Amino acid sequence: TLMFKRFFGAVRTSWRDPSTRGAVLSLAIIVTAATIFYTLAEKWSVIDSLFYAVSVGLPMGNGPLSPTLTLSKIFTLVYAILVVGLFVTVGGSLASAIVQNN
Amino acid sequence: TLMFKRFFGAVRTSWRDPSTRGAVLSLAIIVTAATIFYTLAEKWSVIDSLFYAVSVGLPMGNGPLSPTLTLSKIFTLVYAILVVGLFVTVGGSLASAIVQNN
Amino acid sequence: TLMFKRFFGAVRTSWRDPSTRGAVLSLAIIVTAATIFYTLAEKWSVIDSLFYAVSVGLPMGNGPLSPTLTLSKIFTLVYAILVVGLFVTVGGSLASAIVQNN
Amino acid sequence: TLMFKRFFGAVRTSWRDPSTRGAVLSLAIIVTAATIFYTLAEKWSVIDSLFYAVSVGLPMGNGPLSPTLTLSKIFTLVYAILVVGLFVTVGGSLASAIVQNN
Ligand SMILES: CCCCCCCCCCO[C@@H]1O[C@H](CO)[C@@H](O[C@H]2O[C@H](CO)[C@@H](O)[C@H](O)[C@H]2O)[C@H](O)[C@H]1O
Ligand SMILES: CCCCCCCCCCO[C@@H]1O[C@H](CO)[C@@H](O[C@H]2O[C@H](CO)[C@@H](O)[C@H](O)[C@H]2O)[C@H](O)[C@H]1O
Ligand SMILES: [Ca+2]
Ligand SMILES: [Ca+2]
Ligand SMILES: [Ca+2]
């Protein structure tokens, strides 16, 4: 029941481009590296890993999932300061492009 | 006694419009779209279903509530990337409107 | 051992004022209301209430506490949208006032 | 495998300085002061104390951890109003800093 959101959302406002939305490329790489780490450090599934990844850089909220090891705990810190920005402007560009599509 | 807040709040300062507080229009569809999905897919009650919809762009904090299913995990990201922006400019506009209200 | 922060922070950086940090006054008033509601509605203690209040507009996070009543649930939803933007500007002005203190 | 984030990130793009990233200095001192507080009050392991301390500036989300003493509740509000904006301006400068590195 989400075909509306996926297609008329975070694939629709992507095909709307300047140059400082090369930040969505940066986010992809910090998000993917994070997902690769949480799967392997923390033993979680990919979807749970991509959930937690995104959860540390948006107001979303981690569910049960949170790190348990020092290595993942620190990584979350290092990652957390780097992604917080790439999310903030991707959310802003993406938000305007909703109101520009109305 | 929530009256003071609902009435001197999300209704009072909601009626200050430029052209760019049609973000509130964009938001209400997106919060609602999310709430239908959460009620139907996640099985939850309207209030709690809305409570999670509003939680993924705001520093409120989602309840015991977190998505348990994959679609509701996937969807929460796609929705969350888009709304986080829509929540912010609205939130600033309303706050802006409280200060020049006294 | 908070006597450091409270004097060298919360009562330090406020003693610096423009026009727009009348925003502190509105946030002050919003939070006190919110706390009274939670103490009265949600039965929680004055700090537990005051903690949740501040929880909902900044990223910090509420540990155990989440509203259990439909009435307090909506109160947080309405109160959430108002307070968040006031949190931004008071939190931003107050942080710049650290930087102009070093 | 955190090395790629640690070195190709939170030190690699940490060392792009204007005048206005003296906040990173200010961050170090206030994040440190909190961690020392959390280690001492909350009994917690320094890492977990540094996990909570950062959790409250960023969209991270504190693990199972939260202030359970009143003073640590009283401290966290005072410190969250101060440190949030510092995590914001550095969050963007480091964000801008990944994009400028393409
Ligand atoms: C006189 C005014 C003329 C300019 C009109 C306005 C166009 C501005 C271009 C901005 O950048 C564009 O956006 C995409 C990304 O930035 C590129 O897409 C694509 O670019 C390549 C084109 O093949 C593909 O390989 C890539 O996958 C994909 O990013 C595209 O090419 C590139 O130009
Ligand atoms: C009337 C005469 C006035 C004198 C002129 C004053 C302004 C000169 C600006 C020179 O630029 C500098 O370049 C460094 C490159 O980033 C900066 O970081 C430097 O400063 C750090 C602080 O010491 C060093 O530790 C680091 O090595 C180093 O990166 C430094 O802050 C910055 O000022
Ligand atoms: Ca959380
Ligand atoms: Ca939230
Ligand atoms: Ca957080």
Residue numbers in the entry:
A (entry chain E), B (entry chain A), C (entry chain B), D (entry chain D): 5 to 106
Give the article text.
To make further progress, we present here a first characterization of a novel tetrameric ion channel, referred to as NaKTs, with an unusual proline-rich selectivity filter sequence using X-ray crystallography, electrophysiology and MD simulations. Single-channel recordings demonstrate that the NaKTs channel is a Ca2+-activated non-selective cation channel. The X-ray structures revealed the presence of Ca2+ binding sites, SCa, formed by main chain atoms of residues Pro63, Gly65, Ser59 and Leu62, near the intracellular end of the selectivity filter.
The crystallographic structure determined at 3.15 Å displays Ca2+ ions bound to the channel tetramer within the selectivity filter. The structural model is complete over all regions, except for residues 1–3 at the N-terminal and residues 107–123 at the C-terminal regions (the latter might have been cleaved by chymotrypsin digestion). In its broad features, the structure of the NaKTs channel is similar to that of other tetrameric pore domains, with a TM helical segment-labelled M1 (residues 21–45), a pore helix (residues 49–62), the selectivity filter (residues Pro63-Met64-Gly65-Asn66-Gly67-Pro68) and a M2 helix (residues 73–101). The narrowest point along the intracellular vestibule occurs at the level of residue Val92, its side chain pointing towards the central channel axis. The diameter is on the order of 10 Å, which is slightly smaller than that observed in other channels in an open conformation, for example, NaK (10.3 Å at Phe92) and MthK (12.9 Å at Ala88). Three different diffraction datasets were analyzed to identify different ion occupancy states (by virtue of the I4 space group symmetry, the six monomers yield three crystallographically related tetramers).
